[PDB]
Amino acid sequence: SQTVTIPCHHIRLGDILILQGRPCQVIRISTSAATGQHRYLGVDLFTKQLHEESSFVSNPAPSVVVQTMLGPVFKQYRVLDMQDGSIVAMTETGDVKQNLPVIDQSSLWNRLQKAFESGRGSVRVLVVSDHGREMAVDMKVVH
């Protein structure tokens, strides 16, 4: 309910994966000489520390070999207000989050503020959770 399984051949630099239980932005992908597993080096979205984790290899059916990692399930919240590096957000069911932080990554705050001031009702934030802690890590505009 918190994670989604992603095939390694669909993982690129910049993707967000769960590494050592933490949501992280991938900054390096390499291959283990001994096992053929892929190794992902990432930056923890919350603490900014580096973490690495290698892929899980499975053989679920004859001649089917799968290598996967976990990615987080992103939630999408409406944006009701913006106040000093945090936002007031609303869930799909109307639950209000008063002080939701916004990651300082790829000018997200500035892009969010421009989109919010053009049309407030169509702006959404994509939100990751880390052990009760929520943060807005990207944005979308609904059509």
Author numbering: 30 to 172
Q: How did the manuscript describe this experimental structure?
A:
Here, we present InCellCryst, an advanced pipeline for producing homogeneous microcrystals directly within living insect cells. We have demonstrated the pipeline on five different proteins (IMPDH, HEX-1, Cathepsin B, Luciferase and EGFP-µNS), representing a selection of soluble proteins of different source organisms that crystallize in insect cells in their native compartment or, in case of peroxisomes, readily in the cytoplasm or nucleus of the cells. Importantly, as shown for IMPDH and HEX-1, InCellCryst can produce crystals from native protein sequences, without purification tags or even remnants of proteolytically removed tags, within a quasi-native cellular environment. The rich source of biomolecules in the cellular environment allows the identification of native ligands by co-crystallization at quasi physiological conditions, representing a unique feature of InCellCryst.
The N- and C-terminal addition of single amino acids (cyto) leads to spindle-like crystals in the cytosol. The disruption of the native PTS1 signal by cloning into the pFB1 cyto and cyto v2 vectors transformed the hexagonal crystal blocks into a spindle-like shape. Whereas HEX-1 cyto and cyto v2 both formed spindle-like as well as bipyramidal crystals, HEX-1 ori crystals exhibit a hexagonal block shape. For HEX-1 ori and HEX-1 cyto crystals diffracted at 100 K one distinct unit cell population was found, whereas two unit cell populations were identified for HEX-1 cyto v2. For data collection from intact crystal-containing cells at 100 K, we carefully transferred the cells onto a MicroMesh mounted on a light microscope stage. Serial diffraction datasets of the crystals contained in viable cells was performed using a helical grid scan approach, available at the EMBL P14 beamline located at the PETRA III storage ring (DESY, Hamburg, Germany). CrystFEL is optimized for still images in high multiplicity collected at RT at XFEL sources and thus, can be directly applied to serial synchrotron data. All HEX-1 structures show an increased flexibility between Phe145 and Ser151, the C-terminal loop region after the α-helix.
